[PDB]
Design a protein around this nucleic acid. Structure first.
Ligand code: MN
Ligand code: MN
Ligand code: MN
Ligand code: MN
Lengths: 103, 78, 96, 95, 94, 105, 95, 87
DNA sequence: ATCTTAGGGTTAGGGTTAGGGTTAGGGTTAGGGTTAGGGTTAGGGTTAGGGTTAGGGTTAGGGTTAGGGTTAGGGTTAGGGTTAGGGTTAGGGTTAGGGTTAGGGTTAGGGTTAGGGTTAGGGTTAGGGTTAGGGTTAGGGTGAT
DNA sequence: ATCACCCTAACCCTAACCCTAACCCTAACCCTAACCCTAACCCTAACCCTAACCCTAACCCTAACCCTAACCCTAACCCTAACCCTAACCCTAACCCTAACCCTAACCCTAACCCTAACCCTAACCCTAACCCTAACCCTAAGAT
């Protein structure tokens, strides 16, 4: 498989097919699906990492959408990247304004 | 049915947003703003359904309409 | 008997630290079908499509409440008013 | 019925690498699938434009490269451009 | 040298129809050219997606029309969908 | 009529639009009536803009429409403003508007 | 000697009713080359590219002033303060 | 043929009167004294974000000259679509 | 409330820059021949929707109480408006020069074209861990002596 | 603070249901293959951007008086918060009906591709009219008498 040739879990062959099928350009380079599957695999791992940590904190083993939201909004970069995105069943980060605290 | 979105249901959504005091005029203004949002999303969702020559508005049509509106939704098979 | 603005602070934590929906599924499904009928008649809605719409709405409104609250606090207040929702949606590029 | 494609096989594999003593909800897997699809399109579409702007008819890893630099935030882009050039380099070596 | 494409010939033709005495700045023609190009790719790209969503390999006037209904505002879309269906109808006859 | 634009009653280039649709990577194939429909939608919108702009130029005693006239036409229409809401017309300036509380008592 | 307000209100009309740029072309061109230098050295700028950047900047800042002013008026004021620019940017999604 | 003069502190070139003019177009009557620095901060951020992407386009095109198109493509990426300089 | 005074709005024709009319020319759109694959009919499987029954009990809703936030109004500094003048560099049209983009010529390898081969992953089934749900508990502040 | 008051998190109980481990076969990816052209290389042109000279009066900056918007306390008012208990209605739990979606089978016709073709339209050139600029021109309304 091309994924094993590149040291990847993400499907290099599938990404290459989606690039020509999706009407992005006339031709698709040999290393473009390899580079892309790796960038997608990196980002999924970067998310899964912080999400498993949030699941660990909440005494759970299985990451639910709340853990994904907590991981995203607690990062600065993942939040900026997914700034105009809504995680269904994610809820909000717990934050109460300082002026709305007891006197 | 816009009154089905009750004053206590609106108050819960204000609490999640970190709202301490909620004016009485708010409960009506929220109903207005929610109706506008729903109209704009469903209108595009239906335009997708109608283009697909279907009578059933699918989860994908609602997803495509949300993305068009810039309120991209994750988790609905998009 | 709790002081004015103490059950409110307990409620905020109760809901922020939760993810369940805050509008009942049936009144919402009625509103969705009413609005859709005003665009096209003889319409069916996938169970999932309605939930996709409900999630979208609440997430929007909560985010709108966040900005609204920031506007009330900007004008030395603690209570959200229509003038705040209007300033939030105006600067958000929803209103002129 | 029809065939439903998914990145679940790979989201599972990658989860097992970072947290082997951690699992994933059916809803959370849908959120992860939506994330992969969104970012796929974001990068692919940006590379499609670069290819076009420079009168070229091919999306190469150089187009993916600059799309990542444009779309991903500061450090995330640094590490993605790294892991990407890495995987390409390794792929060229092994035929 | 290289040749530079433009919609200036047509922006001029259309200007004379509407205001036969009114003229146009070189900068204003640039703004009009940017407008035509922006709206071209807004509609084309939306039609490209509609075809993809419905597993269709072709962009037909049916995809252009729903893209117009999605992108333009209420009364502008109505008149554009009108003006468009008319030109297509006329084209099919001749 | 030998050009496709003349067959459709258009000024906008039906042949050029058809070429840009294929040459722009939007889909595998381009329908016969899609460039016709599109050139007409673009021609309609340009005429709708040019109309309101010529009016703003005539109000300003000018013969020629400059980018200020285009901006004035866009921002004064409700739909054109919504359509070009997140767009900047270079050399367009702003609509003259002063908030009521900033006015002399 | 005009009262405090009379020259400000005259200036607002003078500029709103006009389209010329409000930052001098040379100080702005230095700022652009300084900033660009700090991303990549040995950079040339097309005369037009700089004007494209200047137009973009002023149009942005004027629009930012519009929202900022609406924030000062919201808190019963007439003068724009940093807390207003910050709230206008917070709500605009710039943070 | 031999040297480029050092570019330094040009954010002050965006003077207090130049900032005043931009406030007038936005319909601003009173302008705080702290504003002139806050505006300089915000303008610098805007310019960094636009030029950064413009240069990423220039670098992709294998060029040393940042064109008007690169600045246009960068502005469109930022959602501040500019009319008039091509495209 | 009358009266001077400095503002833009205006007119003038000076007078320059620019747009639009104009030429010829270079490339693109149109023509009409062949081509095949998307799409469009057809029937007809079947999934998934809405319909309409039911039993609480969760939740919505009116109307009790005072709490303290919003608001008003007046008084307090002091902050940013406005004036002037002397610099102070921005802006004007210069001038040359070569780093830089790039026509346009030539060749090659990258990529698509085909298919038939294995092999990965969709679609299902199912047993069993993780979450769920209900209770009593320690834990930690809430409101008031 | 010091006192009772609530409540929500903390543990440990046992149950519902969905992860995720499982199998099987489908369809997708992969290694045979010729085959065409896009991109790479190399050139030079040729613009165009950079920096170089020149002068200047536009425009900035710096401090001066003080006009007045900002923000302080306080006091009046009622807006909405908390608390309650009657009661509507949302919620699973459950069933069938069959309209709507879509499988995939035949077959037509649309959109592709091709070369020569003429016709638009790019560009390079040229004059004259729009508009730009600075001369006074009265009108107007700012803001002290
Ligand atoms: Mn530097
Ligand atoms: Mn001061
Ligand atoms: Mn040279
Ligand atoms: Mn045909």
């Amino acid at each position: 498989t091309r994924s094993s040739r590149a040291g990847l879990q993400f499907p290099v062959g599938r990404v290459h097919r989606l690039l020509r099928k999706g009407n992005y350009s006339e031709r698709v380079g040999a290393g473009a699906p390899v580079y892309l599957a790796a960038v997608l695999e990196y980002l999924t791992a970067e998310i899964l990492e912080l999400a498993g940590n949030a699941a660990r904190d909440n005494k759970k083993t299985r990451i639910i959408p709340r853990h994904l939201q907590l991981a995203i909004r607690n990062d600065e970069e993942l939040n900026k990247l997914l700034g105009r995105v809504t995680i269904a069943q994610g809820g909000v980060l717990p934050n109460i304004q300082a002026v709305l605290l007891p006197k | 049915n816009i009154q089905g979105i009750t004053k206590p249901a609106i108050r819960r959504l204000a609490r999640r947003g970190g709202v301490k005091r909620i004016s009485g005029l708010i409960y009506e203004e929220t109903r207005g703003v929610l109706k506008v949002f729903l109209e704009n999303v469903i209108r595009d969702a239906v335009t997708y359904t109608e283009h697909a020559k279907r009578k059933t508005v699918t989860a994908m049509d609602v997803v495509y309409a949300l993305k068009r509106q810039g309120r991209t939704l994750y988790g609905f098979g998009g | 008997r709790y002081r004015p603005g103490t059950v409110a602070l307990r409620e905020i934590r109760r809901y922020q630290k939760s993810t369940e929906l805050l509008i009942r599924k049936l009144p919402f499904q009625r509103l969705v079908r009413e609005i859709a009928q005003d665009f096209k008649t003889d319409l069916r809605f996938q169970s999932s499509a309605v939930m996709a719409l409900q999630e979208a709405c609440e997430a929007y409104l909560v985010g709108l409440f966040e900005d609204t609250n920031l506007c009330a606090i900007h004008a030395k207040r603690v209570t959200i008013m229509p003038k705040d929702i209007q300033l939030a949606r105006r600067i958000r590029g929803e209103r002129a | 019925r029809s065939r439903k494609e998914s990145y679940s096989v790979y989201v599972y594999k990658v989860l097992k690498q970072v947290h082997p003593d951690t699992g994933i909800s059916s809803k959370a897997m849908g959120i992860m699938n939506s994330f992969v699809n969104d970012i796929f399109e974001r990068i692919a579409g940006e590379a499609s434009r670069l290819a076009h702007y420079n009168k070229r008819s091919t999306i190469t890893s150089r187009e993916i490269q600059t799309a990542v630099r444009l779309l991903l935030p500061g450090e995330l882009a640094k590490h993605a451009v790294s892991e990407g050039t890495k995987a390409v380099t390794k792929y060229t070596s092994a035929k």
